[PDB]
Each structure stands twice: as structure tokens, then as C-alpha cells.
Design a protein around this nucleic acid. Structure first.
Length: 204
DNA sequence: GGGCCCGCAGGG
DNA sequence: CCCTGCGGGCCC
């Protein structure tokens, strides 16, 4: 539903599980990387190193579309086994870009800052191929905007949709000096589900 | 009512 | 250690 930050949830907020990010409003889907409607646009997305074509550079990153995958056998993830399409959440994210939607060669917003805002969450699994992933769980990293998107062959050899997102947010990134100071001042700390830690105090 | 899914953990 | 496939929410 909502575009932009969630009122009163500062950049640097951390949650241990995806479900907690969801109940916060920050990223509603419990599994999916993109939260979006195909005739409106995308509200939030997660970098979790789930797609090999994701490259994260912090203040900007190239995100991969979802799909191009065989999820037979009641799967949630798989390797690329066919071309992605500009449909569903992929189409949603493309609409955020401040340029006419083109599903053949993609598009670029000259005035990208005028595009729709995307809430961006970074998850620890993104750490294999990124300097910007938190050490644990999920972290709210602020607002980014889609500069451009285009199709190309991924590492797998199949077509993927690729999106350049660039940061556009007055709250500083949590990996920066000021981001770290703010987090410290606010006392931001990993949020666990209720009862979770107690259940872990059950090592015997 | 069916599709989708950047998680997660039980059980091998 | 590695593997399998479940709920449930949200979309359409």
C-alpha cells in the first residue's frame, strides 16, 4: 500500500527474521524480494544474495528481477532455468522509474529522483557478495529510486531484468560514520520475536 | 481459487 | 554436514 518510509522507523532498524520486517510494514512479503503491484509500482525490496546477478555497491546497486525459475515441488527458490519477464513485481519495480514503461529494452529516467521511492532492506545473506550486508538479520537501509532497468543475459545464461537503484535519503546509510553514530544515539539493536531468546536459553 | 515466493528449519 | 519442501500473505 504505502510509498516512502514507515513513519517512526529510522534507517538502521534491525530485525532477525523476515516475518518481523513484514509486521513492521517495512517489507510486507514474508519471502518475496520485491513488494509490488503490476499496475501501480514497487514499495520495498530485499537484498539477500538470493539472485546471483545482484551487485550491491551501497549507495547504489543493480537488483535482479524475480522469476526465470522452476518452482515445481513446492519450492520458494531455485536456479535460473528460463528467461525472466517484465511482469508481476518486475513490472511493478519498472513503474517506479520516472520514464515510460518499456518491456522490450527497458528505460532510463533522466530525472530519476522524481521516480517513486523504494524502501530497501539488506539481509545478512547478501554478505557473501557484498560489503554492505549487516552481520545478522535484516536492516532497513532507507529510500532508493530506480534510475534505469534493462534486460540482459545473467551469469546463468538466461535473460534477467536488471534495475539500477540509487539512494535518495536524508538519513545517512548505516555503514557510514554518521549512520553508525545515529544508530548508537538511538540505541538501535537487533529485534527478536517475542519469546525467541527465552526459547534459546533452552540450551539444556 | 491459483500463482508466487531474495526463508527457514526439521530431518536426512 | 546437506537437502527438502512447508506455512501464509499478498497478488491477480
Amino acid at each position: 500500500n504505502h510509498y516512502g518510509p514507515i513513519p517512526g522507523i529510522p534507517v538502521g532498524t534491525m530485525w532477525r527474521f523476515r516475518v518481523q520486517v513484514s509486521e513492521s510494514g517495512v517489507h510486507r512479503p514474508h519471502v518475496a524480494g520485491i513488494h509490488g503491484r503490476s499496475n501501480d509500482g514497487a514499495y520495498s525490496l530485499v537484498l539477500a544474495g538470493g539472485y546471483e546477478d545482484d551487485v550491491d555497491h551501497g549507495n547504489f546497486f543493480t537488483y535482479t528481477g524475480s522469476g526465470g525459475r522452476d518452482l515445481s515441488g513446492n519450492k520458494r527458490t531455485a536456479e535460473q532455468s528460463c528467461d525472466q519477464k517484465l511482469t508481476n513485481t518486475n513490472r511493478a519495480l519498472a513503474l517506479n522509474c520516472f520514464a515510460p514503461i518499456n518491456d522490450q529494452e527497458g528505460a532510463e529516467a533522466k530525472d530519476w529522483r522524481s521516480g517513486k521511492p523504494v524502501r530497501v532492506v539488506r539481509n545478512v545473506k547478501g554478505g557473501k557478495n557484498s560489503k554492505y550486508a549487516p552481520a545478522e538479520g535484516n536492516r532497513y537501509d532507507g529510500i532508493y529510486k530506480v534510475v534505469k532497468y534493462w534486460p540482459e543475459k545473467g551469469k546463468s545464461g538466461f535473460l534477467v531484468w536488471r534495475y539500477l537503484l540509487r539512494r535518495d535519503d536524508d538519513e545517512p546509510g548505516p555503514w557510514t560514520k554518521e549512520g553508525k553514530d545515529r544508530i548508537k544515539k538511538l540505541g538501535l539493536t537487533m529485534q527478536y520475536p517475542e519469546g525467541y531468546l527465552e526459547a534459546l536459553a533452552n540450551a539444556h
